[PDB]
Design a protein around this ligand. Structure first.
Ligand SMILES: CCCCCCCCOCCOCCOCCOCCO
Ligand SMILES: CCCCCCCCOCCOCCOCCOCCO
Ligand SMILES: CCCCCCCCOCCOCCOCCOCCO
Ligand SMILES: CCCCCCCCOCCOCCOCCOCCO
Length: 444
């Protein structure tokens, strides 16, 4: 799932998101499939808080543009003590992810939905002096959105839904730049095999953006036992804006070159500075999901779900400055599928148990996968439980645990000329687990 995150509540996490938001009176419908809101008979307010623990590691090699094993370079440029390098260490993280849903039926035909969601999120921080520093150091992306939706009941077996999401994305990327290595491979300054890791500066890009998105859905209940749903979330145009700066620890090599205007001579059309304003498109991919919930009896309900994400829109990551390209990195993500199956079982009038599993394809591919987002296909295994209060005017608590088994993937990353011409040869191992807890208030 690259850097897209499931936008559900604890109950959803408990069943690996199977059935989407089609289970009875699930406030998450306010965003996931607004149409299902037409079948929620009362006011519901819900808050979810997840903690995601992600483990990321690299095992392998890295080479400079001349085929030499990468080294740790120098403390502060030629003449200073040589530094050692490393495997990057643990690049994973632990993060909190809140989610809120509110559903308010208006008429016997209309319902209103409000929600706070986190559509996008990823993070990887490799030790600054690791062997793959020419490809990545830090990567941080998070998208939080506020939503408003409306549902319209056409029949007692069909309804439609539509909504708008106001999204805010913040992004950060840091990566080592080796000007001498870039020059050696340039169309204007090549010829001399400058040694690698003599010049070095940390490139840092910080950008943000707020823009609107639209989504819609439809629900069809053929047999009171079966609830089918189709939801579509359109791609969200998202041009991130901010700045970039280079933190040189070169003994003055990098700044001397830049102030000397040598970069533009190496790569005509390039206007690199020690710092400047910047932009980078990072559209939130469109996706569609088909959900089906079948109630076998008064205690067992199962759900199946298939989501097609149009990750193909993420063709490249291009850093621009004043409308001009600084560097364009191809990623050519592939469209993806995510299948889930799971369900709920009411043990008593108070207790309910959940479980589920899902298969989620990674949009990354071998030719372009790098250390920023080194994921692979994942298998999701979830367990959940819910408790409705005895002496309460309707307050339910839910818990969930979810483990994500990610397959070990290869990294064969090659850097283009202006990025130093180096390459990686290894594999990333990742692991993920989520703890979820929510409180649902059925005030009505
Ligand atoms: C502030 C950081 C954004 C927080 C991101 C929350 C995303 C957490 O995980 C949701 C479940 O993801 C499952 C798989 O494990 C992650 C994959 O390995 C990472 C390499 O691409
Ligand atoms: C398989 C890896 C895909 C990597 C995608 C990471 C994209 C996520 O967002 C990064 C934040 O966007 C802003 C960065 O600046 C643009 C490019 O970096 C500049 C070159 O050093
Ligand atoms: C182009 C992005 C500007 C973001 C401002 C949000 C504009 C307001 O909502 C439009 C949808 O209604
Ligand atoms: C994100 C893209 C970065 C693009 C970098 C291209 C860098 C190109 O070459 C610049 C040439 O640098 C040459 C030498 O090293 C500097 C030494 O000081 C020399 C003073 O004339």
């Amino acid at each position: 799932a690259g850097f897209m995150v499931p936008t559900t509540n604890t109950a959803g996490w408990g069943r690996a998101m199977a059935g989407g938001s089609l289970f009875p009176n699930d406030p998450s419908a306010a965003f996931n499939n607004p149409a299902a809101m037409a079948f929620i008979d009362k006011r519901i307010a819900q808050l979810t808080v997840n903690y995601a623990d992600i483990d990321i590691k690299y095992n392998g090699d890295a080479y400079d543009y001349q085929g030499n094993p990468m080294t740790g370079g120098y403390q502060d440029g030629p003449g200073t003590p040589e530094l050692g390098t490393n495997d990057g260490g643990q690049a994973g993280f632990g993060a909190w992810l809140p989610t809120g849903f509110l559903v308010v039926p208006i008429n016997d035909r209309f319902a209103f939905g409000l929600s706070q969601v986190v559509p996008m999120g990823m993070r990887s921080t490799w030790d600054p002096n690791w062997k793959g520093r020419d490809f990545a150091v830090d990567t941080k992306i998070e998208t939080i959105g506020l939503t408003g939706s409306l549902s319209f009941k056409v029949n007692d077996n069909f309804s439609l839904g539509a909504g708008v999401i106001i999204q805010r994305t913040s992004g950060f990327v840091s990566q080592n730049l080796d000007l001498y290595a870039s020059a050696a491979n340039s169309p204007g300054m090549g010829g001399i095999p400058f040694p690698a890791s003599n010049s070095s500066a940390l490139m840092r890009v910080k950008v943000d953006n707020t823009s609107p998105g639209f989504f819609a859905g439809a629900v069809w209940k053929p047999t009171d036992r079966d609830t089918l749903g189709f939801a579509y979330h359109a791609k969200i145009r998202n041009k991130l804006k901010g700045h970039y700066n280079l933190y040189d620890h070169d003994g003055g090599l990098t700044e001397g070159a830049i102030e000397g205007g040598t970069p533009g001579l190496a790569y005509p059309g390039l206007d690199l500075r020690m710092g400047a304003s910047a932009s980078a498109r990072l559209d939130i991919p469109a996706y569609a999901s088909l959900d089906w919930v079948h109630q076998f009896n008064d205690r067992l309900s199962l759900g199946a779900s298939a989501t097609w994400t149009e990750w193909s829109s993420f063709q490249d990551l291009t850093l621009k400055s004043h409308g001009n390209t600084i560097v364009s990195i191809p990623y050519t993500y592939r469209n993806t599928w995510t299948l889930a199956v799971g369900g709920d079982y009411k043990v008593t009038d108070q207790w309910t148990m959940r479980a589920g599993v899902a298969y989620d394809q990674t949009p990354t591919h071998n030719a372009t996968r790098d250390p920023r987002i080194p994921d692979g296909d994942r298998y999701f295994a979830s367990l959940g439980a819910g408790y409705r209060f005895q002496s309460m005017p309707e307050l339910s608590i839910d818990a969930a645990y979810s483990r994500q088994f990610v397959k070990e993937v290869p990294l064969k990353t090659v850097n283009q000329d202006r990025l130093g011409g180096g390459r990686l040869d290894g594999r990333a191992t990742s692991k993920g687990q989520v703890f979820s807890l929510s409180a649902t208030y059925d005030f009505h």
